[PDB]
DNA sequence: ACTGGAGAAAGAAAGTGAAAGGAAGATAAAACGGGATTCATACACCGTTAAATACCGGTTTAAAAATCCCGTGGCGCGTTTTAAAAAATCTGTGCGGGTGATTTTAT
């Protein structure tokens, strides 16, 4: 990410992306998975969220065929 | 001649691999101290007796005990410090289903 920790360094202008996007499987554990990096962006980098940087992509999870 | 982009030089600041050495550990050789045997030899217990000591009666006298006056330092009180012990609060960890990853050899 590039911008540091610690509130000391931590610089919110130094950030190397403008979209960071979540995109994990499509089961529970990805569920899972995304609350735990949601947990982590609030409570370590308010400043991104609230600016608007963070998205969640939605693949799909079954594909159906006749004929 | 002039402008602005771009590439190359040059210079200064940060990360790096290697560095005696020394306190901090670690590991062996040595000196020590505490049990099992083995007796010869000195020690414990039993009769006999001369002698050394305990005890009583009455002095005494010099020394220690008893008594009075006083002037202090050594305990007692109140109030602070300061370690020491106790109660309270954090830190790891493993049990069993789940998610995702690493390494070395032969031909």
């Given at each position: 990410?590039?911008?540091?920790?610690?509130?000391?360094?931590?610089?919110?202008?130094?950030?190397?992306?403008?979209?960071?996007?979540?995109?994990?499987?499509?089961?529970?554990?990805?569920?899972?998975?995304?609350?735990?990096?949601?947990?982590?962006?609030?409570?370590?980098?308010?400043?991104?969220?609230?600016?608007?940087?963070?998205?969640?992509?939605?693949?799909p999870?079954?594909?159906?065929?006749?004929?």
């Amino acid at each position: 990410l590039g911008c540091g920790i610690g509130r000391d360094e931590y610089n919110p202008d130094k950030l190397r992306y403008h979209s960071i996007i979540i995109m994990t499987d499509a089961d529970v554990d990805g569920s899972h998975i995304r609350t735990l990096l949601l947990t982590f962006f609030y409570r370590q980098m308010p400043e991104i969220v609230e600016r608007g940087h963070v998205y969640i992509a939605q693949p799909p999870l079954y594909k159906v065929k006749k004929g």
